[PDB]
Nucleic acid binder design. Structure first.
Ligand SMILES: [Mg+2]
Ligand SMILES: [Mg+2]
Ligand SMILES: [Mg+2]
Ligand SMILES: [Mg+2]
Ligand SMILES: [Mg+2]
Ligand SMILES: [Mg+2]
Ligand SMILES: [Mg+2]
Ligand SMILES: [Mg+2]
Ligand SMILES: [Mg+2]
Ligand SMILES: [Mg+2]
Ligand SMILES: [Mg+2]
Ligand SMILES: [Zn+2]
Lengths: 144, 174, 37, 216
RNA sequence: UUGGCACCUCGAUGUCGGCUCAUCGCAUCCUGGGGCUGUAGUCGGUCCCAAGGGUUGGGCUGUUCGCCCAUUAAAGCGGUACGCGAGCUGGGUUCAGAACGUCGUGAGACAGUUCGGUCCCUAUCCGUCGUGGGCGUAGGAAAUUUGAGAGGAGCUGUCCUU
RNA sequence: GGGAUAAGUGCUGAAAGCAUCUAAGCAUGAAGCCCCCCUCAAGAUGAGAUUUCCCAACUUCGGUUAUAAGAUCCCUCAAAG
């Protein structure tokens, strides 16, 4: 008999969390955050709905890289114009725009679907320690 | 690291204070502060400072040697300072002191001026000899290098700014 | 500078060193200077 | 740094001291007022909003831009100024010097000042690649069936597409253009006119924005 | 590049050169920064970094090439269906005529030559260049704006002085 | 002009009592990179900001209404097409 529970917007409740990016590797922080955004850590996780929780990331500037990624790691973007390839190093990206580095890493670890895009929108990253979502009453989360 | 193992003697006048890895060395001429490697452990005695490598791993051995040498340089520097003499060679080559800054004329249509830095002294003797004196060995060396870079010694005639004890290879003109 | 895959001492004075992940020869004679590449 | 808004009256010539002929553009910069001052504290950047040329006051059944609307009249009234046809910001000018409701005069600029003039270029309408992009015509004889065409628009199977930024026929003119390093030959306080050496972008009766040259 | 192979296309994938318009690589022609020199200076040789921009007009030939003339800072080398024929030309090549040499008994034939010789197509879709409408942007509006992004530009001679 | 760099050139410096531009550290270094200059740009759905304008009655209390500010139709036109 068909007995599997399916989550719906009526029965889904999304919490808010804060994660400190200080002394955390970009990839390993990103991989864990993506799961929280997807709602993989919930027992009521349903694939076709968003059961995941909102996540706030603070101190994005204090994210750490290993080896020579600071210089060697390059981000390429194309403008869709002939010869329109632009490059930023990971270190430079962290300095100029710490938030984008974190966001892009996590968004790359999310599914490329309409739901997936929505799950990425629930991510909020701030380079400083302070965050503007006090009204949301976020709960501090410690990476496992 | 034989160098690392060797203790750094402290002059009685000089006073050294260690704050974790960072070390502040106080001397009559000046006070120098640097941050040593965290792994390296430093034992301070009134007579002398001893630095011991935590492990026999290469990385620690290299840092031990560097740390020891750096600490020794600071203490010696505050005690006596480091002076490097640069001598201009060739006709029409002269040095003149404008305030703190040094002005050099070396076969350039434009006159050359080098800004003075803190904990550095620029002085010219006979208009051909310049002395850079400071507590920091590195800082003295860096500024001296800049002075030499203005006009480096040429092989053919030896004309240019050179270190007093520098040797220049000589090539026959014709 | 001589840039070549075979970097080796041309004379006794030449000294084999590794700088910035590249093997190089340093010597009093400027000619003997080499860089692996 | 100084900025004034004016209309392009037209071009003329003036004879210099040495008898050199100086081509000049006549600009009328009457009725300039500081309508608003923007600061980093409030707006996030420092600039002065300047309105040029008075328009008629609000009327009940205005069908044209000649008469000011209620929203515009309020903004001008806050400055204690009449409603203005053209309003533009000057970030170059220092906010502290100017005050809201202060008249900006031609006398601010002086003769011999190097300036950058901004205006919308004259509109040419729909134009072909030759006129619009300065492309070469094809042969006009020798069996030619190619005269004013754009030429090849790409390669072949490699790419199999036209690249973005391919120069093709389209609407020409109406672009904002800034001519740099022009000079003020003369300033007439009585006529409210500034004489600018050379030619400035746009049609006659077109708004021109005169600023101190950024490059110095 | 010359080939080898015969795997797509023979109910058609137009073939050389030029023109128009480019675009990309760098094994850099010029300009920029360097090392070494059998580098006196002025000039050079060689090697390393560098693709931002630039990189001419003619005579001969269908030519590509090449040679020549006169320049230039320089007259780069390649890829893009040897870029580009629903963008152009059609001189060469590759139909029917004719002729020469040559071969063939002949009809005829010749990467031998010579003279002449029909280049279609109203853009559906993507793409590209311009120009509007709808809705969104949690009230409805008029203006002035920030810039996440994106594009453009980016070259060099000579002379004087020192 | 500025910042960061390439090939380079160093300063201090050990592994390796010497030496060493590099390992830690610290400088300098190109028409090139990122800026500076010019133009576009909030469908930047992450849709931003500033200033100003308009602001009532009904009602089943769910909301509706024409109207406000405003903008158009239509008409005279060009600097626009
Ligand atoms: Mg050999
Ligand atoms: Mg032509
Ligand atoms: Mg015709
Ligand atoms: Mg085609
Ligand atoms: Mg077979
Ligand atoms: Mg078919
Ligand atoms: Mg190269
Ligand atoms: Mg072809
Ligand atoms: Mg033909
Ligand atoms: Mg025949
Ligand atoms: Mg044949
Ligand atoms: Zn040697």
């Amino acid at each position: 008999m068909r007995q599997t529970f399916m989550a719906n917007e009526s029965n889904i409740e999304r919490k808010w969390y804060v994660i400190d990016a200080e002394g955390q590797t970009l990839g390993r922080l990103s991989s864990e955050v993506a799961s929280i955004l997807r709602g993989k850590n919930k027992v009521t996780y349903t694939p076709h709905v968003d059961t995941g929780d909102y996540v706030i990331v603070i101190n994005a500037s204090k994210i750490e890289f290993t080896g020579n990624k600071e210089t060697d790691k390059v981000y390429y973007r194309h403008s869709n114009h002939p010869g329109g390839i632009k490059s930023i190093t990971a270190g430079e990206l962290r300095r100029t725009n710490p938030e984008r580095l974190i966001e892009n890493s996590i968004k790359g670890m999310l599914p490329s679907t309409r739901l997936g895009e929505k799950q990425g929108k629930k991510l909020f990253v701030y380079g400083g320690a302070e965050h503007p979502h006090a009204a949301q009453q976020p709960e501090n989360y410690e990476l496992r | 690291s034989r160098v690392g193992k060797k203790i750094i003697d402290i002059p009685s006048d000089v006073t050294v204070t260690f704050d974790g890895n960072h070390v502040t060395v106080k001397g009559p001429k000046g006070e120098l502060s640097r941050t040593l490697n965290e792994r390296m452990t430093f034992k301070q005695e009134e007579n002398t400072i001893e630095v011991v490598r935590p492990s026999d791993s290469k990385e620690d051995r290299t840092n031990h040697g560097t740390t020891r040498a750096l600490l020794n340089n600071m203490v010696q520097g505050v005690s006596q300072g480091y002076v490097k003499v640069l001598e201009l060679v060739g006709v029409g080559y002269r040095a003149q002191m404008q305030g703190k800054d040094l002005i050099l004329n070396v076969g350039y249509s434009h006159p050359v001026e080098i800004k003075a830095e803190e904990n550095i002294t620029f002085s010219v003797e006979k208009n051909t000899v310049v002395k850079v004196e400071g507590i920091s060995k590195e800082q003295v060396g860096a500024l001296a290098s800049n002075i030499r870079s203005v006009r480096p010694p040429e092989p053919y005639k030896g004309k240019g700014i050179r270190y007093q004890g520098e040797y220049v290879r000589r090539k026959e003109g014709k | 500078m001589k840039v070549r895959p075979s970097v080796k001492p041309i004379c006794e004075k030449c000294k084999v060193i590794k700088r910035k992940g590249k093997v190089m020869v340093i010597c009093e004679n400027p000619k003997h200077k080499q860089r692996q590449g | 740094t100084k900025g004034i808004l004016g209309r392009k009256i037209g071009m003329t010539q003036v004879f210099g001291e040495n008898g050199e002929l100086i081509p000049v553009t006549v600009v009328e910069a009457k009725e300039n007022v500081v309508l608003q001052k923007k600061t980093v504290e409030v707006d996030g950047y420092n600039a002065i909003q300047v309105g040029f040329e008075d328009k008629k006051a609000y009327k009940k059944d205005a069908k044209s831009n000649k008469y000011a609307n209620k929203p515009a009249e309020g903004h001008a009234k806050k400055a204690d100024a009449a409603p203005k046809r053209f309003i533009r910001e000057f970030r170059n000018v220092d906010v502290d010097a100017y005050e809201v409701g202060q008249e900006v005069s031609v006398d601010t600029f002086v003769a011999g000042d190097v300036i950058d003039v901004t205006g919308v270029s004259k509109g040419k309408g729909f134009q072909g690649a030759i006129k619009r992009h300065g492309q070469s015509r094809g042969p006009m004889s020798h069996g030619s069936h190619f005269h004013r065409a754009p030429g090849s628009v790409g390669m072949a199977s490699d790419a199999s597409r036209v690249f973005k930024g391919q120069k093709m026929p389209g609407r020409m003119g109406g672009n904002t253009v800034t001519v740099q390093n022009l000079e003020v030959v003369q300033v007439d306080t009585e006529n409210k006119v500034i004489l600018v050496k050379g030619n400035v972008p746009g049609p006659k009766k077109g708004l021109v924005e005169i600023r101190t040259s950024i490059k110095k």
